[PDB]
Amino acid sequence: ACTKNAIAQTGFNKDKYFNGDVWYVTDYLDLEPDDVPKRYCAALAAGTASGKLKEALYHYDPKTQDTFYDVSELQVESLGKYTANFKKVDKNGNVKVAVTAGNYYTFTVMYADDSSALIHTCLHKGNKDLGDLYAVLNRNKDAAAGDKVKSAVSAATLEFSKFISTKENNCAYDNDSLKSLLTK
Numbered sequence: 761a762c763t764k765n766a767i768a769q770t771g772f773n774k775d776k777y778f779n780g781d782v783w784y785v786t787d788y789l790d791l792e793p794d795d796v797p798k799r800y801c802a803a804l805a806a807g808t809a810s811g812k813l814k815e816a817l818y819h820y821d822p823k824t825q826d827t828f829y830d831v832s833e834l835q836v837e838s839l840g841k842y843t844a845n846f847k848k849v850d851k852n853g854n855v856k857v858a859v860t861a862g863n864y865y866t867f868t869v870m871y872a873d874d875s876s877a878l879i880h881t882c883l884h885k886g887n888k889d890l891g892d893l894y895a896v897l898n899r900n901k902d903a904a905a906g907d908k909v910k911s912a913v914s915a916a917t918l919e920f921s922k923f924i925s926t927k928e929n930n931c932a933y934d935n936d937s938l939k940s941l942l943t944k
């Protein structure tokens with residue numbers, strides 16, 4: 761179940777966030793913690809491609825090796841809050857599971873600056889959801905969370921101490937495929 765109406769950043773700069781570059785997940789918190797593994801790797805690219813607002817996702821379970829990419833088209837609900845379709849694709853953009861009405865996520869940018877961000881997502885796959893999932897992002901895959909983003913976590917009435925880090929998982933990312941997938 762998702763339970764939070766996440767508030768977007770006041771004065772969110774959409775062009776900076778959606779610049780075509782990659783964001784790595786450095787820490788995550790699911791309010792239903794059993795919905796996601798204790799060890800995980802994820803990243804995303806966000807940008808406008810031929811006028812269309814897009815996100816490309818990468819997920820990797822470092823223990824099971826389960827791997828998947830997705831291409832998302834985002835619709836705007838309000839500045840910094842989006843509803844995203846998804847299609848599951850291989851790394852080259854070939855469709856494995858097509859867009860369907862019932863497969864979507866909400867996506868809220870709670871805090872961002874040039875190098876870090878705090879987002880919330882609620883994933884729906886038909887009648888199931890993956891709970892309220894918060895993620896701290898950085899442009900640098902190895903960056904420890906700094907004060908701007910940790911303060912944002914506190915301002916959302918969360919505790920960064922409770923987030924699970926992705927840093928000890930030997931996560932390795934294909935940045936080229938994430939960037940290219942924005943066009944797909």
